[model samples]
Target: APNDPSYRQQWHYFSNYGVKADKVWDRGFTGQGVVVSVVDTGILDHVDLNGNMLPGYDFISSAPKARDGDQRDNNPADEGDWFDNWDCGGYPDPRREKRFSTWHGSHVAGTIAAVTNNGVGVAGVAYGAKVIPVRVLGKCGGYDSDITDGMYWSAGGHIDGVPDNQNPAQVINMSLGGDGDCSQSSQRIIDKTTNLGALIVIAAGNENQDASRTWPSSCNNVLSVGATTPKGKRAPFSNYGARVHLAAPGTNILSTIDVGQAGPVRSSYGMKAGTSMAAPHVSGVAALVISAANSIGKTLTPSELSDILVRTTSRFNGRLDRGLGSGIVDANAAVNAVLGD
Candidate 1:
C-alpha cells in the first residue's frame, strides 16, 4: 500500500486526525531496528533520505554558525540555513525577508525516516526506522552549548571532541525549542538522555502558552509533543499546559524537503506546520514503540517508552479542559502497547 508517489499526501498518516500510522503498518511494525535522532537543521542528501540514513553529527560550534566551513566536523550536511538580510539580526520587520533554507533537518528526517515502499516520495512514520542526522541548528539558532552537546551526543553521551555515537539512538527527535525554563544544561542532558536508553521526543512550543515555559519542552525526562489539527483539535499554535505529553498531526505536514532557496538545491516535498511538525509524530511513534520492544526479545526502558506512548492515546477530539496531553499519538495503539496486545 505504499508505492510512495506522495502516499496520498501523508495526511499525517491516514488521517482521522492521523497518527494511526497505517495501523502500525498493518502490524508488521515498520520501524525495524529503531534509531531516530534528528536534532534539527541539517540533513539533505534526499532521495527519500538515502534509504534511512545514519552517520550524523555537526554540533555547529560556529564557523559563521557552521555554514559548513568548519568548527565541528563529521558532516551532518544540510549546509544551508539561509540567512542574508544582514544575516539574521536586526530584522524586527523592516519588511523582513531572506530567511529561507528550512530543510529543517530534512523535514524532521522525513517524519522520522522516509524511504517507505520507495516508488518515490512521502510516507514515513517509522519507515523502517534509522535516521540520526544530528546537527544542532545553524544560522542564527543553536548553542545552548551547541544544543546540549547535540543532546549529549545523540544519547550515546560523551562528547569531548565528538566521535562516539556509532548509531546510539533509540529515539531522540527534538523538533527544536526555545523561550525558557529547563536549563541547568537542559536538565542535565535530559537526564543523561533518559539514562541512555534514549526516547526524548520534545517540541511542545509554538508558544500558544504554558507548555511550562518551553525549553526542552520544560525538560526533565522529555516526551513533550502537542500540536494537532486535521480536526482532532489542540493545534491553535499548540504548546498546551502540564508540559504537554502527547498529541500529534501538527497540520499541513507533508515530508522530505529541499528545494533549497538558499544553498544546496533540488530534492523535494513540502508542507510544514509546527510544534515543529509535532515532534516527528512522537518521534515516529517512539520508533514504533522501540520496534515493538525489539520484536519480543524486549527492551522497553526510557520510562517504558514514555509509558507506551502515554498509554496509547486517542481521545482529545477537543476541549476536555484542553491541556492536550495523553491524547492523540496512537500509532496502532503504540505498536499494540509494545506488543503485549
Candidate 2:
C-alpha cells in the first residue's frame, strides 16, 4: 500500500528501529481533519508538498535575514538562508562548510504531510493532515524572541502587531533551537500555548551534549524528542538529558526538499540529520493519534496525548538509553492505544 519513488529510503517508516508508521496507516487514521503547525524556516512550494498546506504567516522581524526584503507577510515561503561563516554568529569555518540556505521548513513539513499515495516522491507520517507554515527561523537561525512569537501565533494567541490566527493548530512542531537553558520568555509563551489547548513538540537539539542545555526542548510540559539512528542507537549528534521525552529516527533522514530552490538545497528529495528531523516524526504521530481519536468522537487534550505517547513508546532493549527517552516512538502503538486497541 505504500509505494513512492523515494519511499525505500525512508527506512524510518518501515524498520523496527524506525517509528513504524505503516501499521498506523493500516488503521485508517491518516491525520484527516487535523492541523499541525510547523514553526521553523518558512515553508516552500515543492512537488511532494502540493495541496498539503494551509495559509501560514512569516514572523521574521528583520529584512536582511528574511531574504525577501519584507517582514511579517502572508507569504511564509523560504527564499534562502545561505550566508558567510562570518555572518552566522561568527561560526568557525575551519572546514569551510558551505553555509547554504537549508530549505529546512519544507523538509520538516513534508515529513509531516507530503501528499502520500500520489505516486510521486515520498510519503508523510500523517499524509492526510494539513500543515500551517509559520516562518520563525531565518538566515542563520531564529532568536528566542522571534521564535516565541511564532509559537504564540500558532496556538491562536494574539501577537502584539500580527492579526489573530484564523486556524489554530492542535499540535505545534518546533524543529529549531540553539544551545541554552529555557529562557523566561520562552517558558511563558509555551505555558500560554499549553493553556490554549495546544501540545508542543520540540527537538532536543543536535549538540551531542546535555539536552538540559537546549532551549524550548528543556522547557516544561513539552514532548521533547531526541535523534536515533536506523540501528536504533542514539544518534551521535543527538543531545540527551532528563528532559527528553522520547527518541525517533534522525540519522540520514531523507525527506522532501524544496524543488524550487527557495534557499540552498534544490531537489525534490534530500537527506539531513539532526534532532530537527526527529522531532517531526513525533509531531506526525501526534496528529495520527488525534485523528484516530477524533474518528471515535473522542478528543484528546495535550496532556492526554502526551501520556499516551509516553505509555505506548517502544523502549530500546526494554529500557531507556542514556541520551534517549522511554524509547523510539511507535506510531502504530500510539494510534492503537488511542483507538482503544
Candidate 3:
C-alpha cells in the first residue's frame, strides 16, 4: 500500500463508487512517460505536487487578470483570484460579496499527478504521470481567446510569441467551461490540437442541465465528463446529456490545496466538488492507458484512447437513463484493455 497517510481518505480510488484506480497501480502501469496539461486558474507550489510537475506557462493575456504584474509569463503559479464585489467588474455578479481565492488548478492537478507513496499527502489517480500547468483562468474567470490559446500551446501547437513546449502533453484536462454552444474559434483550435495527437478531456459543466449547452464540453474532438456522487449516482449538480462521454467521482474530492483565502499560503489539502473534479479522473485514466500501451511498444490515437475509456466503464449503481454517459470511468478496466489483460 502507498505510504501516504491520506491514502485511506481517498475513497475515490477504492470505494465501490470509485474508479478502482488502485487495481491499475497494482499492475505496475502508473502513467509513466505520459504528460497531462491542466488548463485552469493556475497551479500552486505544493509538496504533494512538486515531484510530478513540469515547468508550465501562463496564458492569461490580461495584465490585470493575470495578477502577476504582467500579462503572460513563464510562471504558472496561482496568484490569488480573490476579489471584492466590484473587482471583477460585474462578471461574477456585482451584488455578491468578496470571494476567496480557490487554489482551483492546484487541486485539479493533484487529482491527476500528486506524487504518490512518498509518505506525504494524498495519492494521485496517475501518480507517475507528469503534469503541465497551463494557466488560462484568473480574476473573474478567463477569456475564450486565452483559454483556446493555452489549449493549443499545451498540445504543442505554436503561438508566435510563446516558446515551444519541450514536453508536449499526450492528454489535456480542462476542468473549466461555460454555458453556450461550442464556438467556431474554440472548435477549430480543439481540432488542430487533437490532430497533433493530444487527447482533450473536459468537464461537462455543473449546471445540472444538458451538457450540450456547455462550450468546449459541447465541442467535438473532446471527451466530456460528468460528476457522480460517492453513492455512485449522478451528482445533483452535474450537467448531463448525450454529449457527456463518461462520469467519475466528484463530490467532496480531497486533493492538494492552499491555506490562503486570497493569496499564496502554506500548501494543504481540501475538498471540492463539480464536474471540474470529475474530468481529471478520466484524464489520469487516459494517461494510464497511454502508459500501458507504450510499455508494449504501441501507440494509440486520441480517438482510440477515448473509445477505451467509454468501452471499459462500469455500469452505474443507479439507473443509466439519467444521461450520465457510459456510467462511471473505470481506471483498472481501461488500463487492462490497453494491456490486453
Candidate 4:
C-alpha cells in the first residue's frame, strides 16, 4: 500500500531475522571484526549513523580528506540513492528535494552490513561487519575512471599521493556497472584487485539478458549476479547470458534512503528494483562466508568460496532461474558449507 510509506520492507530478499550471520554470532563467528568496502556513489550522512561511519577516502576528487561533505564515512543505517531512468538519472525527485539520487553507494552498503536489529533501523546481512565507504560514483552517477581508482583504494590497492590509510577492506561490493562492453582496462583491474585477495561482487547489468555476453560481468573471474523476482524468475531487466553466476532477490527490495528535506530523514530502510540492487545480497552473503571461515581458524581461498556459492546455486532446467545465475543467495547455507567442512 502506497499509504504505508515504507511498504518496500514487506518483500524481503533474505530475512535477517534468523540466519547464519546471527547463527555465527551465537558461535562467536560474528563478523565483528570483518571489514567491507562499498564502491559507488556518495552517501548521505543520516542521523542513525552517528559513530558507525568509517572514515573513507574519496577518489571522486583530487583532495585528500576524502570527506568534503560529498561522501559518507561508514554510517550503515539508511541506504541512499543513485542516478536512474525514473528520475532521469537524478532528476527532481520529490522525495529527495533538490538532491539528485546519486545514492547507489548507500543502498549497496546497507545490504551487506547495516546496523542490525537496532529496533529503529533495518538489519543488514552481516550486521557485525564493518563497512568502508569508498566514494567512487557521483553527480549523474559515476564514471568508470573514478570507479577504477576507488576500487583499488577500497581493496587495499596502492595509490600514489594518497595517504596510506583505511582498514584494508576484506570484501569489496560494487553494485554498479555500465551497459557497455567489458574493457581490457576494467578486466585487468578486476583481475588485479581480486588477486590482491579482495573479492569483488558486481551487478550483472539490468539489460534483462545474459551478462556473459555483456562486458564486465562476462569478464573472466568476476562474480556476476543477476536479479530474481518474487516469482523466483529473473527480473525482466536483469542482465543474463551464459556467464551469470548466482541470483538473489532484486525486485522491489526494501533498503535505506534519505527523505531529502522530508525532515528527520528516515534511518530505517526501504526497497529498490534492478539487478544492481540484487548484487549486494550476494556480497553480504559472501561476507558471511568469509567471516565464518575466520571463525573456524581458516581462510578459504576465493576459489573455494566461489565454488561453495556456485554449488549451492538454485538451478532450473539446466540453466539458472533466468538472470539469476545459480539462485537466491542463502547466508546460512554458505556459512554452513564452509563450517561443515
The candidate that wins on lDDT is 3
- Estimate the TM-score of every prediction: 0.34, 0.94, 0.97, 0.80
Spell out the clash pairs found in candidate 1.
Answer: none
- The residue ranges of model 3 lying beyond 4 angstroms of the native Cα positions read 91-95
Please give the TM-score that candidate 1 achieves against the real structure.
0.34
Ranking by lDDT: 3, 2, 1, 4
With candidate 2 superimposed using the best TM-score fit, by how many Å does residue 337's alpha carbon deviate from the native?
Answer: 1.4
- Candidate order (TM-score): 3, 2, 4, 1
Clashes, model 3: 0
Better of 1 and 4 by lDDT: 1
What is the C-alpha lDDT profile of model 2 across 193-252, one tens digit per residue? 977989999999887888898887768989999998877888888999788989889988
| Decoy 4 TM-score against native | 0.80
Model 1 poorest ten-residue lDDT run: 89-98
The most accurate candidate by TM-score is: 3
Residue pairs that clash (backbone atoms under 3 angstroms), model 2: 79-262, 80-263, 82-101
Off by over 4 Å in 1: 1-34, 41-56, 59-62, 66-69, 74-133, 141-165, 168-232, 238-246, 249-274, 284-288, 295-313, 318-327, 335-338
The whole-model C-alpha lDDT of candidate 1 against the native structure comes to: 0.83
- The lDDT per prediction is 0.83, 0.85, 0.91, 0.64
